[PDB]
Paper text:
The dihydrouridine biosynthetic reaction is catalyzed by a large family of flavoenzymes, the dihydrouridine synthases (Dus). Dus2 is the eukaryotic enzyme responsible for the synthesis of D20 in tRNAs and is involved in some human cancers and in the detoxification of β-amyloid peptides in Alzheimer’s disease.
To determine if the dsRBDs of animals at the bottom of the evolutionary tree retain the same double-stranded RNA recognition mechanism compared to the dsRBD of hDus2, we crystallized the dsRBD of Dus2 from A. queenslandica, Monosiga brevicolis, and F. alba. Unfortunately, only A. quenslandica dsRBD led to diffracting crystals that allowed structural resolution. Interestingly, the validity of these models is supported by the superposition of the crystallographic structure of A. quenslandica dsRBD, which we solved at 1.68 angstroms in this study, with the dsRBD coming from the model (RMSD = 0.426 over 78 atoms). It is equally amazing to see that even the orientations of the side chains observed in the crystal structure are globally preserved in the model. A focus on specifically the dsRBD revealed that the overall structure is conserved among all the models. In contrast, only one of these positively charged residues is observed in F. alba (R400) and A. queenslandica (K381).
Author numbering: 6 to 100
């Protein structure tokens, strides 16, 4: 049951842990493979905020937006966490 923001973005509080994906495909890879098979448009729109220099990414798949509600220490972490939100909400099986 994701949180829904005012503009309709679907969010979950997710931190990306790179240690869980050492030498294996990352969440962005799984999500990209799925959107490629479905021919779905996918884009990441990432921002860094001035107050603490953390990052947040809004991933759009077709006309649906997903993002992590946890601001991340890096651009990569914000994008990977947003991909994990999309994977978990859509229900895409990952290892
Ligand atoms: Cl982080």
């Amino acid at each position: 049951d994701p949180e829904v923001t005012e503009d309709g973005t679907l969010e979950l509080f997710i931190r990306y842990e790179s240690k869980d994906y050492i030498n294996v495909p990352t969440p962005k890879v799984y999500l990209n493979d799925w959107t490629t098979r479905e021919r779905l448009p996918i884009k990441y729109n990432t921002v860094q905020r001035s107050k603490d220099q953390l990052f947040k990414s809004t991933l759009t798949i077709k006309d649906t937006c997903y993002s992590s509600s946890l601001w991340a220490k890096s651009k990569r972490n914000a994008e990977q966490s947003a991909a994990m939100v999309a994977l978990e909400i859509i229900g895409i099986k990952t290892p």
